[PDB]
């Protein structure tokens, strides 16, 4: 484009679309569960994943992923969300903070404790 | 929950009245001196203007008339007079008028 063009028109600055509607730029947000399914993977990988419906304080109905060898999230349990889409699980843009609220941390974890919300197992 | 920092209001009233009785004083006298020049009372017109010019500068002495405020007042009255007295020349006294 000619320098004149660049003047009459100017350069269009690229706008960023937030892959996260947690309304606020809040890192987390609480919500009560509704339905807790077992969605099936995408194309390559197959298995049975644990997922949950969560109604947020911001007022958005979303699908959150629950990590760990298995949880204990009942029908109307309160939980916490951090966000991180799951490649092979479509529509799942968020995640659950394990260990906060009425959501528990995995049992028998002896590794990546920082995540999963377990606790330092007192050796003996 | 009382505050002795309301006496100011308790006092503002006294001044409100105060200023009021002075300004309205002017307004009236000016509006009196003015109607006189219409009829052509070259004697008493200046007799009243004088009572005006006095009141005015007296309000500037206090807090009533801002300062330059008084000045406007004076210019607006004398100029309004003289022009009228063109309908019937000759100022008898020559009080509030230099010539």
């Amino acid at each position: 484009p000619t320098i004149n063009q660049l003047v009459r028109k100017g350069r269009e600055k690229v706008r960023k679309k937030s892959k996260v509607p947690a309304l606020k730029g809040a890192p987390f947000r609480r919500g009560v569960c509704t339905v807790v399914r077992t969605v099936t993977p995408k194309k390559p990988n197959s298995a049975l994943r644990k997922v949950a419906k969560v109604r947020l304080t911001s007022g958005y109905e979303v699908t959150a992923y629950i990590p760990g060898e298995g949880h204990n999230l009942q029908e109307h349990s309160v939980v916490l969300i951090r966000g991180g889409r799951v490649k092979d699980l479509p529509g799942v843009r968020y995640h659950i903070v394990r260990g906060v609220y009425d959501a528990a941390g995995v049992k028998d974890r002896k590794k990546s404790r920082s995540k999963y919300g377990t606790k330092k197992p007192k050796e003996a | 929950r009382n505050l002795s920092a309301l006496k100011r209001h308790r006092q503002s009233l006294k001044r409100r009245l105060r200023n009021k009785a002075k300004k309205s004083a002017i307004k009236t006298l000016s509006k009196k001196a003015v109607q006189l020049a219409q009829e052509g009372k070259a004697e008493e017109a200046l007799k009243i203007m004088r009572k005006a010019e006095s009141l005015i500068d007296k309000a500037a002495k206090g807090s009533t008339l801002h300062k330059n405020a008084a000045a406007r007042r004076k210019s607006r009255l004398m100029r309004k007079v003289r022009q009228l007295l063109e309908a019937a020349g000759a100022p008898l006294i020559g009080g509030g008028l230099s010539a």
């Binding site: 320098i3 004149n4 660049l6 003047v7 | -």
Partner: protein, 104 residues
């Protein structure tokens, strides 16, 4: 220093007041070429002397009317409509390019 500008009287419909077209040139803040912008300042002619197509100098003055903070200083060059025409045609073109109705 009271600002002084130079321009052309483009409007002569007003009482004692004249519209002045004032052209300004300057390098663009990022693209560097010299862009030429402009503005109309309402001047103030007491004696109704300055006429259309006259180039005058403007000088910052005591406020006079809402939007008329300049008095006319002197005349620069009388007799130059060529400039005014430009102002006029651009105005005319403005009658077009809308959503009322286009024709020929």
């Amino acid at each position: 220093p009271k600002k002084v500008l130079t321009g052309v009287v483009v409007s002569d419909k007003m009482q004692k007041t004249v519209t002045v077209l004032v052209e300004r040139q300057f390098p663009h803040p990022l693209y560097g070429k010299v862009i030429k912008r402009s503005k109309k300042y309402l001047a103030h002619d007491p004696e109704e002397k300055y006429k259309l197509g006259d180039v005058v100098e403007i000088i910052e003055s005591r406020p006079i009317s809402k939007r008329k903070r300049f008095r006319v200083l002197r005349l620069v060059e009388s007799g130059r409509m060529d400039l005014v025409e430009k102002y006029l045609i651009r105005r005319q073109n403005y009658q077009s390019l809308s959503k009322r109705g286009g024709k020929a």
